[PDB]
From Swiss-Prot, chain A:
Disulfide bonds join 6-11. The chain holds residues 90 to 110 of 110 of the full protein. The lineage of its organism: Eukaryota, Metazoa, Chordata, Craniata, Vertebrata. It comes from the Eukaryota. The gene is INS. This is Insulin A chain.
């Protein structure tokens, strides 16, 4: 989930878009 | 983990901007 993917590494805006509705 | 709590706060504000009118979901677990 987003904490494992984006708190251990910086997520780009494109990666952050994976958690949009 | 406080540093995890701190990171999540910044993730939710980034999701808010990125996702716009779609909204998002924040699921720690
Ligand atoms: C809920 O417990 C999250 C599941 C995975 C745990 C990973 C926690 C890593 C957070 C690191 C934060 C560092 C930010 C500088
Ligand atoms: Cl911080
Ligand atoms: Zn902070």
């Amino acid at each position: 989930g987003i904490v494992e993917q984006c708190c251990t590494s910086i997520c780009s805006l494109y990666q952050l878009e994976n958690y949009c509705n | 983990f406080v540093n995890q709590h701190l990171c999540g706060s910044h993730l939710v504000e980034a999701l808010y901007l990125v996702c716009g009118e779609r909204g998002f979901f924040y699921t720690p677990k």
